[PDB]
Design a protein around this ligand. Structure first.
Ligand SMILES: [Fe+3]
Ligand SMILES: [Fe+3]
Ligand SMILES: [Fe+3]
Ligand SMILES: [Fe+3]
Ligand SMILES: [Fe+3]
Ligand SMILES: [Fe+3]
Ligand SMILES: [Fe+3]
Ligand SMILES: [Fe+3]
Ligand SMILES: [Fe+3]
Ligand SMILES: [Fe+3]
Ligand SMILES: [Fe+3]
Lengths: 150, 150, 151, 150, 150, 151, 150, 151, 151, 150, 150, 150
């Protein structure tokens, strides 16, 4: 609706994603365990940092960030499912990639939204984030033997 | 119950607790803003580390950690509330200290349990976490003008 | 690029006055929050001195000529300074800080619009990066004062 | 020409330029040898890192970077010449400066094109690169005793 | 036995184990070579440290550590075999894991022994070691696509 | 938990005497092993001042009140001190050090048993970690003197 | 008192002061807890280092430092009191400030004294220590809301 | 030293082609080992770019004139390159890498024998050091391929 | 202590004008030595900004009240500034730099004599350490100009 | 004896030597305990690294390293003895020095052999190792109050 | 002699001392080799730095440092002797001490002289140097079992 | 002249040269002062290190290094001259370059001699030293606007 709605929505998103990353991190099995386990820790730090920056930018424009698991669940478009059946490393990475994709497309919407509201600072912050998400999408798709936009 | 269930319960508690720490971090105001904004950053890292160590130890012993916000909410005894009304620094710190005290007393229950079960590794892990928690209770209570045990 | 150059040179002047004011606060502050805000002012001083040098070199890079004397900074700055003559509270000093950060925020916003319209993309993004941080500072110092960022 | 085509052209350019920086670095003679010999190592790193980011951005948008010397030579607008006749430091810095100007001018075209197409990430990336190039032009022109735009 | 005999027994074990880790480090082949080759280095340092710490704790309680290959071979329960036939990465990891479990299980005896004997320092030393072994067991079993205890 | 508190406060007293004893040795030592042992005392000084602080802060965390004056430390310590009067050899000084280490080891052992029975697991493990290092220093300083750790 | 006796007097003072810093460190309460608790750690290091340098300068001029608590108590002009009555942060800082003022003025006596006895080294050392004490007095007075010499 | 000079200049050409090949592999690779190999190609890139600068500067130091254009490297390289057209498995890309490493090992071996005969000792030891590292890479990358170093 | 206070405050003023002069030189300089000198001014800027802050804080510590506006700095400084209007050579710029360093040397010498007479031993040593560094810069920059330090 | 045999023989030696370093490190007593206890740690890492490099060079030339204690004992010319009766610091160092000299001398044989075979890499590796052994011999000989070759 | 002559005399002395430290560093034997050997590198670097600061202060006052070995030999009061007869560690340390005492006492003259002359910078520089020299004398006399001024 | 005598000769040479580096470092004037002044600091450390390594290598082969200025003057082939007249920066670099060339050629003799004697360690040390010297010659000749061997 506006920048404050978008930013807050991403605070909810990033808190679900962050827990998803830990899910993959904890439950992964297979020959790529050691590298993807560590890779997940890197994603966790990186997206935890995005989330703090998003909330603090929300604060800076007069907004009020969601700040409970209850609120995050209610508001996030990012999905979570409990870990039940064993999943393949590729299936865990597909779920990671699908979420990276949703964030890319939503941030793209937020990039357009903020550009037309004239919120230059939030615009540029969202672009910086998308750049990194776009790079991760390429790399994780390459892990999956696929092209970035394939 | 057992060590697995206790440990899983703490995964849930620690996830609710880290988000609270962010809430305190985001909504704090007052002459102590700078010192406490930063101090909350430190608690965030430390309790995020505790969480990953609890989850991993649970994994090491044959368990399967909660790994969704839905599950954390279903299982945490740590309580959260949306920030729908302003709260002073002292009220936020009071909530923090009460949460630390809840974690201390629960960790104490787990320390006794793991000892009774003969799980020495989880026993020493939880003792080290309590050492830190006990230290924080002294310091944050000192901040509030109170003795550690109130 | 006349106005972009003029705007940049205006901010060189502003930043040199702001930076000395940051020292004034650093030097003269008293109160229970001295140790925290004393150090805080060191950080602010470094950062806005760096903003200043970047602003100056962006100007040079577009064929401009930065103001480079105290006399030029005074003739040109919209940032206000006053000698410290009578004691001020920590809150009074932080209000003067915030007022000046709000001033720089709004003027940088005009610079961002200006550079956007002249198509100076480098300068545009630079001023945007500076404003990001200024907006973050305003939130934090206002929280210290017990006020919402825009109230 | 679109964004992929522009980016891939710069992959070619950056690979020729990077070899030119090495040419200057190796053959330079004169009183400012020690500082400029070192400055060229810095330029080498920075522009090789530009190159990598341009190629990886290209990868992220679904393109395929040139990745052979033949391709770089076929596509580059940046020009190279073997080092036969000896040259003054000024002469070498004038080759370096002219090549910097070519890149600035071509990046400006890219900035505009990438804006038109709505590729915000590639847009910002190219603005950041131009910010550095523009700074380099001011500094190397000063070395030549010239204004940056003269 | 007593604490001295147990500690000395482990000095023997850890020296056989350390050489085994080198064996795996040297002879390993397969797609996970680079990360696993490096991992073995990490394990080599860690278990070299345990060994020095075990020997020094033994020294500090009035004991005399085994200090020759002859004594290690005479005393170790950890087994070794010359590398004659090629082994797969999985088989190598299985030898690693099986030795880690042997150590975990003997350390458990040492923990229990040392608790009866009242040697609190050696007790906690051995608990800290098992903590790490337990974590390694989880991770290498995960690499093997198995639960830690299966 | 009077006893855990009392034991901890006693060691606060002890460690402050011991820390000054380490400086005594640090300052007055002479002989061929000066450069090594002079620096070794600096390490011991840091480590035992760190123990002391952590003992005091744990006492604070259990609701105690740590001794915080030289007078209190002298009134309560079982660690002994003597002014440096007649010259002492390197070995003589190391024997005083080793002797104090042994006293603290044996007293920490008593506190380890005390905190066990009292159910204070945090203080229990703190004390164990401290004894681990003490026993290591005893082995090493006894080695310097040409003796076995427990002889 | 000559240079030796002055220095030896300060060894005693510095040891009482150092224990006083710990007292404040331990017992402090109030909203400035976190920053001032940490500040006491800094002063503790700094004045411990002053003390080691004073004693080693004494050693270097043929002197014999006091090296027991008994001697320190017998010789110190710096005073201590057991912590009984709870004290505000300001009261603790007044005590800190008061003792810094004592040391400043005694060091000034040491500076004059040591100039007269032609001990240039001890002279410059004490000046350096006074420079920092003077800075502390200014900063700690500002905390108390006072001018430095007020 | 014409033949030394000539050998060194030939390796400048080779190393520049190899380095772009490393980037080609780096950029296009796909498969379960992407994350490890992608970083490993960065290490290789740095290392062989470093070898290259060292080869060129040694050439400079002996009175030589390094090739310093893309055209000169192609005219003078024995390492071959081809545009990336059809998808290749990670093993195929590592086979191309190992093949090129082997070519350099073998050519450096010739350089080692040549500089020895000419008595250029510095170049000799520089080449040997480089070969040590290439021989090590061949072992590790053949092991990745499930193969023995020389099979 | 009025003269020490006034002298210190006079130097706060000087160092603020000098500091902006160092940026003027840093920004406007051209010529073959550009890269070294441009970076060297960044060094002088940091060092002299540090000197200034230490002077103000020492002035604070002796009960003084530092000048803290561009206006006060201009009203009190003996160091002179002039806007950059016509181009100047690197030597011309370094001569302006050296001239200012020499003024500060000579004034600091007066402050060393003054603080010595007034018995301000701390300010005395501070001024001497600053002069030590100023004297070495005069040698080095004179050396840059092909001059002996004192000619 | 060819290069592969020589290298494998050194794998055996270095593994016996490394344990002997630990023997000295653990059992030493006397006034120089602290520096020599430390120097043994440095030697252990250094000769542990020689060992790893020797084994890896053997790998790189198509060889197969000894990789068990049994193989090391079966193949080593370096001798070892349980610590049955206490040794002086001097005597422990003479045993250390004797082993350095043995290695030096054998490496000299390997350096000649490897020169005849035209293995330039292994040649240079062995020379670098001997450079260090030579230095240690001078240094440990000096500690013994003797010239390096007497 | 004036300040310039005094400063220049110390450049000569310090260059001789510099080489004397190497002589001791190279030729020393005995149980304290490893400590003292490293101790001489520290001393070498420290007094090398003193010498450099002495020369540069001379330059800064309009002087001209001796800058050839011939000039150092012609002007030094520090004495050197070729190493012909072997010396104990103590004898070497006594030569080191003797030279330190010589520098102490001549610096003391330079301090008095530079005070009269009104050269404050040089006065403080020499005082800082003498402080370190005084400390070395205490420490090296302690090594020799003696009081500092014995 | 054998290996011992050649190495000892370079001990002498290196001490003369290191003092020459200082002379140039102190007395240099001209527009390149700041970069060349620091470059001499680099050279001083580097050739300072060569000298120690030469002297310790000599020790290791049973020799006794020259260790007084008198012995260095009696033995050096490197020449020194008192700085009576100011020299140009180019003249100072010509003197520098000239001495590097002398060392290069004498190292070449030592390389040949040490090869013929079968001292592989010294051979390799000398080669490594010459590598750097050769690089310096290219670089300093480039500064002077000359080709390395011109
Ligand atoms: Fe934050
Ligand atoms: Fe983890
Ligand atoms: Fe890359
Ligand atoms: Fe050890
Ligand atoms: Fe503490
Ligand atoms: Fe000390
Ligand atoms: Fe290079
Ligand atoms: Fe300040
Ligand atoms: Fe290895
Ligand atoms: Fe210097
Ligand atoms: Fe050495």
């Amino acid at each position: 609706v506006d920048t404050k709605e978008f930013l807050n929505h991403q605070v909810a998103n990033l808190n679900v994603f962050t827990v998803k990353i830990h899910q993959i991190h904890w439950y992964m099995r297979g020959h790529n365990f050691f590298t993807l386990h560590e890779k997940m820790d890197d994603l966790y730090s990186e997206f935890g940092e995005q989330m703090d920056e998003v909330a603090e930018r929300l604060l800076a424009i007069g907004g009020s960030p969601f700040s409970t698991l209850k609120e995050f669940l209610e508001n996030a478009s990012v999905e979570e499912a409990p870990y039940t059946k064993p999943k393949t490393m590729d299936q865990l990475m597909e779920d990671l990639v699908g979420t990276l994709e949703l964030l890319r497309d939503e941030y793209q919407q937020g990039i357009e939204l903020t550009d037309k509201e004239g919120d230059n600072v939030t615009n540029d912050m969202l672009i910086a984030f998308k750049a990194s998400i776009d790079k991760h999408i390429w790399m994780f798709k390459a892990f999956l033997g696929k092209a970035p936009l394939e």
